[PDB]
Amino acid sequence: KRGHVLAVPYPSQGHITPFRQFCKRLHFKGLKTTLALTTFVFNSINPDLSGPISIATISDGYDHGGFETADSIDDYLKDFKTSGSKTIADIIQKHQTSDNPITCIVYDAFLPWALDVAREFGLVATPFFTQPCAVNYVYYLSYINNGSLQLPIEELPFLELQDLPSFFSVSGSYPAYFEMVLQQFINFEKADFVLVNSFQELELHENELWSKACPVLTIGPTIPSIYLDQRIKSDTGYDLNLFESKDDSFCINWLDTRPQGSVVYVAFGSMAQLTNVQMEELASAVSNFSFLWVVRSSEEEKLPSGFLETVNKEKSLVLKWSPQLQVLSNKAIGCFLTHCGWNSTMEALTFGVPMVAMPQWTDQPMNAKYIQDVWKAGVRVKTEKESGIAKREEIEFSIKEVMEGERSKEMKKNVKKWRDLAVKSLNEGGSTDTNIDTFVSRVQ
Ligand SMILES: O=c1ccn([C@@H]2O[C@H](COP(=O)(O)OP(=O)(O)O)[C@@H](O)[C@H]2O)c(=O)[nH]1
Ligand SMILES: *[C@@H]1O[C@H](CO)[C@@H](O)[C@H](O[C@@H]2O[C@H](CO)[C@@H](O)[C@H](O)[C@H]2O)[C@H]1O
Ligand SMILES: *[C@@H]1O[C@H](CO)[C@@H](O)[C@H](O)[C@H]1O
Ligand SMILES: O=C(O)c1ccccc1Br
Numbered sequence: 457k458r459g460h461v462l463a464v465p466y467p468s469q470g471h472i473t474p475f476r477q478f479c480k481r482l483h484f485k486g487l488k489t490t491l492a493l494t495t496f497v498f499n500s501i502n503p504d505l506s507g508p509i510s511i512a513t514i515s516d517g518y519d520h521g522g523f524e525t526a527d528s529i530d531d532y533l534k535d536f537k538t539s540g541s542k543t544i545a546d547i548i549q550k551h552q553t554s555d556n557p558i559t560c561i562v563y564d565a566f567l568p569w570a571l572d573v574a575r576e577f578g579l580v581a582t583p584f585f586t587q588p589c590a591v592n593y594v595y596y597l598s599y600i601n602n603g604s605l606q607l608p609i610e611e612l613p614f615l616e617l618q619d620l621p622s623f624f625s626v627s628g629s630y631p632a633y634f635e636m637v638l639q640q641f642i643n644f645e646k647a648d649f650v651l652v653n654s655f656q657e658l659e660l661h662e663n664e665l666w667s668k669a670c671p672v673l674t675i676g677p678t679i680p681s682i683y684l685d686q687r688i689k690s691d692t693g694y695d696l697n698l699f700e701s702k703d704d705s706f707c708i709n710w711l712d713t714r715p716q717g718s719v720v721y722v723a724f725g726s727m728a729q730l731t732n733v734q735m736e737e738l739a740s741a742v743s744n745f746s747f748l749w750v751v752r753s754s755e756e757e758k759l760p761s762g763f764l765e766t767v768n769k770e771k772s773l774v775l776k777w778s779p780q781l782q783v784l785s786n787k788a789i790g791c792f793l794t795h796c797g798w799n800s801t802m803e804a805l806t807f808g809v810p811m812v813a814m815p816q817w818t819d820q821p822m823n824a825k826y827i828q829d830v831w832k833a834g835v836r837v838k839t840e841k842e843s844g845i846a847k848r849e850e851i852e853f854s855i856k857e858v859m860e861g862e863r864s865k866e867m868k869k870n871v872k873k874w875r876d877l878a879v880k881s882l883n884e885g886g887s888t889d890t891n892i893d894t895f896v897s898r899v900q
Contacts (some may be wrong), residue, residue: 459489459900460556466564466586467494467516467523468882469698470799474586474653475562476696476769477678483898484688488556492544492858495523501696508690514533515545520670530632537569542783544573545739560899562651562793565592565640568764571647580899583644585652587798589672590662590826591819592640592652594620596669599608600642602633604885620824622817633818649673651796652840655886657877658805658831677802677878679702683785684806684875685882699752699777700727707748708782717790720855721783721809723750725797728816732758734845739763741851742793750778784809791834791858793801793851797821807870810834810864812854814846 461482465475472493472650479489479735485817490510493501498513498839501520505511517535518525519598544561551558552567560580574581580771585592586646590612598605605624617625623634624714653676666672681688701707711719722742724730729740735758742749751759753776767774780800783789792804796815801823804811811834824836837854857863 457486457488457900459558459560459896460490460551460558460563461527461560461899462490462492462512462544462558464492464544464561464563464570465584466566467497471566471586472497472696472698473694474676474678475564475584475682477694478562478584478651479509480655480677480681480691481675481892482664482686482896484691485892487896487899490547490558492547493539494522497698500698503696504626512547513557514547518737524893526634529630531567533632533636536567540567541770542571542574544570548573548577548579565644565650566636568639568642568644569789571643575646580648580757582647582649582651582895584738585650585672585805587819588658588662588823588826589652589666590656590796591621591822593662593666593669594822595637596641596666598624599638599668610660615825619820619821620814621705621822625821626817626858628815640771649896651675651895653678654802655881657664657881658874660845663780664745673895674881675804675888675892675895677882677888678799678889679806679878680781681882683781684879687883693781697777699775701775702777704775704777707773707775707778708786711748711783711786711788716787716789717859718737718746719788720745720747720791720793720859721749721789722747722779722793722814723778723815724795725800726752728795728797728820729755730758730816731845735759737845737848738853741848741855743767743772744852745855746776748775748783750776752776774857791855792822793855796820796827798823801827803832805871805874806831808868808875810858810867811872812837812851812858814851825835831870831874834869834876835863835867845873 463475465471482489483771490828492514493514517539561574562582562584565583565585571581614787648836650672652674655675655676656674681691792809793812794800796813811827813827815821815824827834828836835854835857837846838850880886
């Protein structure tokens with residue numbers, strides 16, 4: 457009972473969620489955990505503090521208004537390094553005289569400066585990569601190559617330019633985040649372990665390639681236990697949400713009244729923004745089906761005028777935010793039109809829902825390539841090259857290709873094999889269970 461982990465996610469939904477889920481595993485194994493949330497995020501969730509994972513607050517330098525009040529991404533990340541370094545040190549010091557001092561920092565691999573704080577206080581230090589091995593390996597190769605990548609890549613020859621992360625195909629875009637994803641490897645060989653939110657059996661070739669450069673421990677998937685191994689009965693869903701849902705039994709009740717495999721689920725995660733024109737083609741494309749579509753509140757203005765009040769409430773429904781895990785488990789869902797964020801992708805792969813891949817940026821084009829051509833669990837929509845948008849009739853074709861045809865009945869079979877491989881990996885003796893045990897043993 458001696459070890460104590462301070463877990464520091466990048467302050468966004470797709471990073472806080474896998475960090476918290478991993479903390480629930482550690483707690484089940486006997487390791488005490490504290491999750492470090494920025495003050496802005498903490499005051500937005502109003503979290504329920506009566507739980508097995510304690511909460512501490514740190515600062516990114518934007519306590520009042522968070523990221524949207526920062527001038528720029530580069531200013532945000534530099535100020536987060538400054539204030540985050542000092543406020544993470546504050547938590548360590550405040551726990552020094554306690555019953556269980558902090559002994560280990562699990563920090564988002566996006567924040568390599570947290571290793572320096574852990575090492576200053578003599579702690580165990582492990583970066584946590586929330587993206588899959590193939591993506592991280594691609595970034596590692598570019599980092600070794602002064603931030604460039606010459607295709608073809610010898611060990612992954614099937615990768616074309618349109619499959620690499622967006623920073624390689626959109627020249628000069630988001631230079632501060634490009635630098636961030638490359639500099640995850642600036643010091644990662646000096647950490648006690650390298651953790652990755654994937655499971656070995658999902659990416660055998662890339663895991664072993666990446667491991668040759670630096671030993672990594674796959675510890676995923678971070679899907680709640682009740683849906684897979686079921687050894688942690690208290691782990692029944694995601695319990696830290698940065699977004700309000702109107703208490704959606706509304707959503708699951710409605711899905712129950714629908715025929716099996718009849719609903720197209722459409723969701724673009726917590727972050728990605730679609731243009732006016734993109735929303736136009738999407739709304740026209742999906743209105744050919746029975747659909748459940750998350751349109752985040754900030755995105756509604758880009759819907760075509762009068763769209764919300766012309767959805768027929770017998771076949772279709774539009775939400776501000778969904779209980780995605782419950783949606784993807786419900787049998788009324790025929791396919792998942794997704795931006796190919798890594799958590800959404802892994803959730804779809806484990807629940808056996810075939811995907812229509814509509815990647816937008818960052819690692820999403822990589823996940824899309826793996827969804828279609830490696831795991832063969834869905835189809836990527838084609839975007840015209842001069843314009844860069846996917847029009848309504850290609851989107852509609854891609855959804856049909858996954859709902860009905862001969863291509864359809866193949867991809868349903870393939871995607872159903874991943875759930876068992878994940879349950880095997882999380883159960884006693886599995887790949888991920890063994891790696892989590894290795895980490896827990898070191899921490900204490
Ligand atoms: O309406 C929604 C949309 C997304 N999610 C959850 O939000 C996370 C999105 O993370 P992902 O890595 O897919 O995308 P990002 O948001 O990081 O771009 C996932 O855990 C989803 O299950 C949800 O609960 N409801
Ligand atoms: C990274 O930069 C992009 C803009 O290019 C921001 O969207 C992102 O900010 C995130 O925004 C989410 C809401 O859409 C917040 O939930 C999240 O906390 C915040 O980090 C930047 O991270
Ligand atoms: C950065 O750019 C992409 C568009 O390519 C968008 O999806 C994000 O919302 C934005 O932050
Ligand atoms: O890749 C991601 O998921 C990501 C998430 C949040 C902020 C920046 C990035 Br580059």
